Amino acid sequence: SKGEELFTGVVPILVELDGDVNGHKFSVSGEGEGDATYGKLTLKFICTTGKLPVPWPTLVTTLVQCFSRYPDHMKRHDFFKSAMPEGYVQERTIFFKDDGNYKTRAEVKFEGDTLVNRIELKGIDFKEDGNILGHKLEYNYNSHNVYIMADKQKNGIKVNFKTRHNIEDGSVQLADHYQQNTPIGDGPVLLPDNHYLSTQSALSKDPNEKRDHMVLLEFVTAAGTMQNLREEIKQLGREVRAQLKAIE
Amino acid sequence: DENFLLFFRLETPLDNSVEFMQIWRKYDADSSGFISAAELCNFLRDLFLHHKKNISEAELEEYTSTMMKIFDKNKDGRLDLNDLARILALQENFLLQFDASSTEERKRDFEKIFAHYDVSKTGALEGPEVDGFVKDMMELVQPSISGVDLDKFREILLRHCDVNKDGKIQKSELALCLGLK
Ligand SMILES: C[As](C)(=O)[O-]
Ligand SMILES: [Ca+2]
Ligand SMILES: [Ca+2]
Ligand SMILES: [Ca+2]
Ligand SMILES: [Ca+2]
């Protein structure tokens, strides 16, 4: 498929975020590239307004899920690549338990050969020394699944997942993500069966950058969909394996 | 050339895991999960006299010692499952012979598979027929099984697919717990 065709090789990526959280204005510029064949993303983000008023891990989700590896017997479910090159709108509400909430609107489209993500963010009701404005979050990310359901109503998909951000305390800050995705340029898109995205993110620093910044490595893969006899022999084996490991 | 090495000429490869498990179950006398030197010599003594070649027990000890040196990977004095699969020349996992998603092609493959492991032609998997199937099935999902685990594995497998609770796995039972018509 032509959309599926655009992610054959390595695609350069550009990301621009402009945010408003409890009055503090900031901007983030992101460069990198994505390799959908491997579900890989390497990106460097830089805050252009000096110090960032929120911790970097709270922005990983907002700062392009069209680079996910879809197992080829799940290509029918690849919605983010079926909306290309015209692109889609990604709207999110992120509720931080016992704290404020981000609401983001984003356009992800092809501008030439470059995949571009332009985001406006509004954070409100945050607490000045909650873990966000107090910069109390640890510099890492925890892997999890991202659950995807169809939304025939809006010709898009509803997505929902919870991330957990560690604190120095050994505590955990819970962020409840609610998001919808809609094609920008109209046309035929693929609305998928219920499935999830297994994503893991590593956060590093460029030793040579004095600006506030985040280096990001990301791996995303689709799963949760279903055949021949050996695969039934396999899951019988996996269930036998599971049972032996319990009694031990 | 050299004495010994006769045994490799005497060794015809094994196509089936069931027959390997019969030999394994036969010479692990203490059910320790490994093959000792004493037990290996018992296996070699019987293997030779079925071919009616004749060996004084002096060179039976000698050739047993030679085989331990060669195939005991970690020199602990014990051969494990794959140390003996090498000796008996067991070939590739039979289950690797198998895309068929149709309901009738899967029944066709299930017949070929159950025919392979039902050597006894009883219509039910029993004894080393379970072990052979368990070995080939487990090695599709994890590195490799230990000899001590197979008594655990058979117990677990029966609690999954023994619907009538008689101690053996009939054809219909294996078909049902694989999810087949
Ligand atoms: C245990 As091996 C596969 O090296 O014979
Ligand atoms: Ca033993
Ligand atoms: Ca050993
Ligand atoms: Ca039988
Ligand atoms: Ca039974």
Residue numbers in the entry:
A (entry chain A): 2 to 64, 68 to 230, 234 to 255
B (entry chain C): 91 to 188, 191 to 273
What do the authors of the reporting publication say about this deposited model?
We pursued crystallization trials with the BC-module (residue range AA90-276) of mouse secretagogin, noting that the flexible, Ca2+ free N-terminal domain presented higher B-factors in two independent crystal structures, and was not part of its binding site. We presented the 82-GLQNLREEIKQLGREVRAQLKAIEPQKE-109 syntaxin-4-derived peptide as a C-terminal tag on GFP for secretagogin binding. Diffracting crystals were obtained with the structure of the protein complex determined at 2.65 Å resolution (for statistics and model parameters see SI Appendix). The syntaxin-4-derived peptide ligand was bound at the C-domain of secretagogin in the same groove as the SNAP-25-derived peptide. The electron density map allowed the modeling of a 22 AA (Q84-E105) and a 24 AA (G82-E105) segment of the 28 AA-long syntaxin-4 peptide stretch in the respective copies of the asymmetric unit. The binding was stabilized by polar contacts and hydrogen bonds at the N-terminal end, whereas the remaining segment was dominated by hydrophobic stacking between apolar sidechains (82-GLQNLREEIKQLGREVRAQLKAIEPQKE-109 polar interaction/HF-stacking). Peptide residues Q84, N85, and R87 formed hydrogen bonds with the side chain of Arg198, and the backbone atoms of Ala192, Met190, Phe188, and Leu186 from secretagogin. The segment, which formed hydrophobic interactions included contact residues L86, I90, L93, G94, V97, and L101 with Van der Waals distances in the range of 3.5 to 4.0 Å to the residues building the groove. One apparent difference was the presence of a disulfide bond between C253 and C269 of secretagogin in both chains of the asymmetric unit of the syntaxin-4-peptide-bound complex.
Secretagogin is one such EF-hand Ca2+-sensor expressed exclusively by endocrine cells of the pancreas, adrenal medulla, pituitary, gut, stomach, and subsets of neurons in the nervous system. Secretagogin is built by three domains (denoted here as A, B and C), each comprising a pair of EF-hand motifs. In mammalian secretagogin, domains B and C undergo conformation changes upon Ca2+ binding, and form a surface groove in domain C for the docking of both SNAP-25 and syntaxin-4-derived peptide ligands. Here, we identify secretagogin as a molecular switch between syntaxin-4, a protein facilitating the movement of reserve vesicles toward the active zone, and SNAP-25, a core member of the vesicle fusion complex.
